[PDB]
């Protein structure tokens, strides 16, 4: 019954960092293996293609890390406010906690507008 914190790792489509993201997840799993998530959950949204994504939990069970798949997405609208809100509402439904944090992996260009 963890209720204190959800760490949400958000990995929208990056074109060419997908493999790097898998290694990021593997690295984070090596921490879950140490049984640190008694009051917290780790929830991950990852685009496996530009149009396909999965939401899953990293948890510690029977002395090991485990991926619990929560749902899949087809054509998620992750570049839109409504799409991001809907994903975050999914995170909250699967993981009701007092606090939330967000880890965002992708290419970055600061404040620069998409439309220039």
């Amino acid at each position: 019954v963890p209720t204190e914190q959800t760490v949400f790792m958000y990995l929208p489509w990056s074109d060419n960092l997908t493999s790097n993201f898998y290694q990021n997840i593997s690295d984070l799993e090596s921490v879950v293996e140490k049984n640190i998530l008694k009051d917290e959950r780790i929830i991950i949204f990852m685009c496996t293609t530009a149009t396909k994504a999965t939401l899953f939990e990293l948890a510690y069970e029977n002395g090991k890390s485990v991926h619990k798949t929560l749902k899949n997405y087809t054509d998620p609208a992750y570049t839109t406010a409504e799409g991001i809100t809907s994903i975050l509402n999914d995170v909250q439904r699967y993981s009701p906690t007092k606090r939330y944090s967000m880890v965002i992996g992708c290419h970055g260009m600061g404040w620069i507008p998409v439309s220039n």
Binding site: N16, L17, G105, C106, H107, G108
Partner: peptide
């Protein structure tokens, strides 16, 4: 060598 690639960056993000």
């Amino acid at each position: 060598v690639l960056t993000x």
